[PDB]
Homo-oligomer: 326 residues x 6
């Protein structure tokens, strides 16, 4: 790896610093991008890795994790916490999913190429240098500009029933209203046999207040679950529920796709209950006089996990992803 980092991850105490990722530009051939990293190590216990900003426009983890990284102290800690709140820095500056450097979706570039373009090199550092240190990974996402999402965690239905149990338990600990079992960074975590949670904590290009609340509590809840900091998870839900309701997305049927490009009007938001064969929304063809909207229907019973982001949708886009009980 060409990405330089001087942090001693074996050292007791707190270190807050940067990994320095080389970046060549026309007027800065030897330029660097500074990726914030904080590590708190003390006492005895497991390593929790918290990442945010893998996509530049996904704010909730950037906020939750940098806030924690400023405040967390060695004497609060039994084990180790590694925090990278803002991984894809170039993309964070442009507030986009894709890299303004090489156009790549970094979360389609793992495990990476140490000699590749920026996103490939960064993917490689993450998977090869940072990740092997982790006992558990929480990679914090939202839908960015693509959809809204109802605050939630997510995981894969694992082969190993033991690992499957631990990830479920960690997700219950995290305590979002829902947990959804479903070349990404998470594919790397899973391939190394490390427990893997992701989150979906908003979107619509905006900051989700409830998403931030849920995500800040979530990462503390995981540190408590893992016994890295004192206490037990606070998992109470605003509509009365005492904890996380497990869900799944396994069926082509769970997706409402747009057949044509146009202006899509939805009938429901995320978190709302929906049933099969009924109206999901209409694609209006505002370009035409007289022409009637094209009705879309859900083809699943369940609840809306992702709902329509941009008003103007392109053929091939999902306008809704419906989740159902696990």
């Amino acid at each position: 790896s060409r990405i330089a980092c001087d942090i001693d991850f074996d050292r007791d105490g707190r270190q807050a610093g940067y990994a320095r990722a080389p970046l060549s530009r026309n007027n800065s051939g030897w330029g660097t991008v500074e990726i914030p990293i904080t590590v708190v190590k003390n006492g005895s216990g497991p390593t929790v890795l918290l990442t945010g900003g893998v996509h530049g426009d996904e704010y909730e983890g950037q906020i939750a994790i940098s806030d924690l990284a400023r405040r967390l102290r060695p004497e609060e800690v039994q084990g180790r916490v590694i925090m990278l709140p803002a991984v894809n820095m170039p993309a964070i500056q442009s507030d986009t999913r894709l890299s303004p450097v090489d156009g790549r979706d970094i979360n389609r570039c793992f495990p990476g190429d140490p000699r590749g373009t920026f996103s490939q090199m960064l993917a490689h550092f993450l998977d090869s240098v940072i990740l092997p240190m982790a006992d558990i990974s929480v990679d914090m996402h939202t839908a960015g500009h693509s959809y809204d999402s109802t605050p939630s965690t997510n995981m894969h239905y694992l082969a190993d029933p033991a690992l499957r149990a631990r990830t479920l338990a960690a997700a219950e600990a995290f305590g979002a209203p829902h947990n959804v079992v479903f070349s990404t960074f998470t594919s790397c975590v899973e391939r190394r046999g490390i427990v893997s949670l992701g989150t979906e904590l908003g979107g619509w290009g905006r900051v989700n207040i409830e998403g931030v609340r849920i995500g800040k509590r979530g990462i503390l809840n995981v540190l408590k679950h893992m016994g890295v900091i004192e206490g037990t998870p606070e998992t109470a839900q605003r509509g009365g529920a005492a904890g996380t309701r497990h869900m799944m997305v396994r069926e082509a049927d769970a997706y409402v796709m747009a057949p044509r490009t146009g202006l899509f009007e939805p009938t429901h938001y995320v978190g709302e209950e929906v049933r099969t064969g009924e109206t999901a929304g209409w694609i209006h063809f505002v370009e035409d006089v007289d022409t009637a909207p094209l009705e879309l229907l859900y083809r699943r019973d369940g609840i809306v996990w992702f709902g329509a982001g941009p008003g103007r949708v392109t053929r091939g886009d999902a306008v809704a992803v419906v989740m159902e009980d696990y």
Copy 2:
């Protein structure tokens, strides 16, 4: 105007067609952009002009007017209704506020120049050709990608000021807030209402509901279709609460570029001195976020859009009773 339209606006009945706006592209020197226009004219009464999509990322108006354009029949009409739901077609196609043709904010180009670039040409067409026909104008906006907005009308001679408050009341939005298109309507002395029906780059379900109804109420109010404005509110209220934005203190401004986390949403009540939010500097380890305060009491009208804000952006605009 260079923009051609064959519609006979004085003809009784229904005409649905297009204004043909010329556009030169590198592989289409003689290309045209087709702007939808629908006109219903029957009997006797005034002209209502309904415009939407002046900005391309402002949907609710394109939805409400295009749905009404499709369904309104001459029989229910006393007077005349002109309906252009999708004014700025190039920007509608790109989903942006600004034109992909000439880079302009068309809503900074009025009264417009018939010899100018695309947006200036189109601005001139709307003001010089279409607008002189109207007795009231309802111009439908939302905050698009810049903000979110709580469903509302807006506006700004006490007699004509009354007729405007009355038109707004009929519209029936929860709130009416006292070189744009609406500056042309006003200059010409025509009743002028705007709306702010949403934002966050998304389609607002209530914004659509409110706006679909608001436009029917305007026709009722003006005696063009039968009935009375249905102005009942979801919060209990009998109708529109008139509000104002005037003080420089109403705007919560961002002093620095960074990641803005709000404390409140649009529609929510706010007090002077309380925390509006923080700008986070995620580029830095160890750096604390910059806290921002409201300076006014009232309710959030416009609230933060993009997570990453630029120095000199507003992150909240507060309204208060008129």
Copy 3:
């Protein structure tokens, strides 16, 4: 004008040089673009102005005029010929209709703004400095990337019948197969100068017959105006003795694309067509199953402009039909 030119247009003989048009770039604040101008002046007679490359992607005028500018001798001339084969130099370098400098179609910028952006400044120079010297303008165009065109002259119906016949006469001398009755041409006309336009190809390519007709036409115009010796030569490839006068005047002449997609034509420019016959089809290759949309001609005539790009955009004309004048 900010555009400098040291050419003395009243001096006998030959001057070949440039108008220097200021162009501010990020690494060249004081940069200039050189616009070729050749003037030949001798004896007594009228002034002929020949322009090409007003659109960067329209080649035949660039070729025909630059060729004549190189070859024409002051002893052959009685009067004055002013030759600008390559007007819109930045667009010529990008091979585009629109300016890579300010994005403008210069032929929507006349009479121009001397304090405007580059295309407006250049429009002003052409109308205010160059054009007033002219007794006749031939502005050489083609359809560039937009269409193909059958080799032809064009002109406006002048309400004044006297200038109308004078213009018809010049067009007949030019001797293209067909003459069809804020652009540069509108300026020529507002100044009471005889104005001919041409359409000598397109399809993003150089048209061999277009070049031939264009080179001959400008010689013919010189002869017509008495500026060089000889009488116009106007015989046509398909045997006709002279130009046939034509017109386009009805909305019906245009075959418009209702939808964006892949347009397949039935005829090329130059071909006779009849009302209600198939003009072609818009295929929707993004769709399985979906049948193409058939389009019809709405007039009888000869195709003047035919489909350019395979993929057409809603609102594009895919044919323009001309009829006998």
Copy 4:
């Protein structure tokens, strides 16, 4: 492959649907582009793969294959016909040779990389998943925006048994001429019979090109015994079938030494002679400067003719073909 396809290529009957290729955009991270596929399978026989739109600006395959796909009936078929008229959908939408997604010329991306950018992923789908099902591939091209081309098939000089089968398929196609990391490079590596076509260019739709292309793909199905009938290969000038030609030497290429405005003396399909003038590069930016004359260096027929008026140094402005010889 990440490109999902529900089509069962073993099922008798007709399936017309899409390959769903992942395309992450800034406001559509889970977006898809739908690539039209139609398969017809019936009875007993070989598989014919027909592809068009590998380059977005080459129209004649998109028209001919999508037209056949809509109309061809499983009952008519003894074998299997897989039809993708519109392969490079993003480039098709932009009307460009190169991809607007990743800037790649997909026909420089084969065999492909399933973990690569969009064009690499698509190329891998085409070579790995689609292609191995074929006994013969016809990949339909034109010169798009780069040149015009005289209507023709093309193929590589190969193994006399494979060469004979390929030449026989070319003859059946019946274009006026057949000219002996691309897609066709994969077809050949796999030992599948591979035909290409060149059915126009000049950024436009070529009427004869569409006619010849439509007839050609029917003729191949007939040749293969896949549908009933015998190939119809008669030519407008009177010839009974295709005339074999070759492009083999550097001499066959007229090269632009300088950037300028190229005026040709000939078009595609026309006969030319060594030492005759090919055209002139004009320097319209200069007064006084004479245009640069270019010469042909081989006798033959123009196969590819100049496209854009403004040519760049290092561009070919003509490719001359000559009668085929069996001896290479």
Copy 5:
């Protein structure tokens, strides 16, 4: 003007703040750009206006003015000093001459349009709101990315002979080594009959250490000259001269022009004496094997005022501009 400013330019004391220029973006329809303005007013005397950053890539004014703005105290002042070190904020942030907002050279946009695009709007604010207050204007430039310049002031040959002499006097007071005599800012200052100095204090896309020194001292000198702060101008020159030398650029002959695009190698830098007929440099054609470079010659005796910037020059660029002794 749509550009807002709450500063009371008639108030005694120091106000440091911003003009708020509206900038509509796709995700910020109601955005603003904040343009730094510092006013120091005290006692009695004339108003000095100091502007930098009219071009985003000309640094020396930005540095000198923002530094003075930070430090200058009302108690030191008799009159009024208005300081905008960073006028063209969007171009400053992109480090370009041209605006990334509307593509304009702001210095081709004066006197401006209050209803125009951003640069036209800003140009109109500066001319119509700020400039009428000034008794003297120093507008600080450098050659940015286009050239290097030898540190200097500049002015025009004014038709008003008394204002001409006052400007020459002002130039001498500024004390740069050299002072060199319609839509620019300075053209507006001159139309309003205000004393106008420009500067040229570097370029080459870099920060010129002597350019900063001379520029910082220059602006203090003008204040002393105008009587606004105490003291006598410091005009000692590094090579021993007592003060500024008046020079001029007046004829076409003064400009060495590139006839061709290529790689320009100069023989001299700014500040260097050159003679007529001597070699100015060579344009290399690195794209060619064998081709000799094109020799360019100076056509006037004098000193190089602007020297070549970019190595790769475009046909029509100036590659040297020679100044000669001033004559009234």
Copy 6:
């Protein structure tokens, strides 16, 4: 390689031509870029490979090498000289460091991929086809638009002491005022193949450095003389008086003055100037702010400025100076 070249590198005499690199454009699918290559072969001796314009905005190698390529004759030569003055032709045309074809920094692309994008395919041709013919390589660079640099040669520290002596000696013969000892660059390819490798830094600031052109033109002749390919002995006299090259080095993180913030950087020194640890390197001004004081930066090594600030507006994470110190073996 898809890059075609007809030059017979084993043939005596002079061949001046082009390698033809395929470059697919929307209106030229079969387009090519011509990369100039001149080879002079005569008699008996080692092969010297001279490359310039690996970055399009680094001019001094393009001038020095194309000039030598035009003038050099087979009869003055004992061995073989291969000259590519203008390697990255598209970036040369755009006057940029990065490629306008694929946006790559070609010098982060070696050893390259013959099936990749343009810059990758060009990097492969240079390493696999041209580079193996060489006994020594001089790859001529400058700081382009990024920095200025004081005219100098450069080389890595080679663990191998005999190679180090051999490379040090070639640097001495080249005869720039300074030689600076300091994975996907072209030089790393030369090094991997165990060929003597020199770099240069002959200027920058977006401009043509007159002294840089002079030192580069002389240095390549000197290198040829050193290797015994042409007659004579190196000329190593320095403008400032010195008899030859002074060896220096860059080894410590403390050698780099880094910008912690984006802003307008005002330097205190140019390249070539002596500096002291703890003293002021310059200030980052925040011209977007009223009242705000600039941020002072300090040098953290005694020495001579090797690379100095380029752009006025610097970005957080850029170096604004790199200090070199006397060489210690």
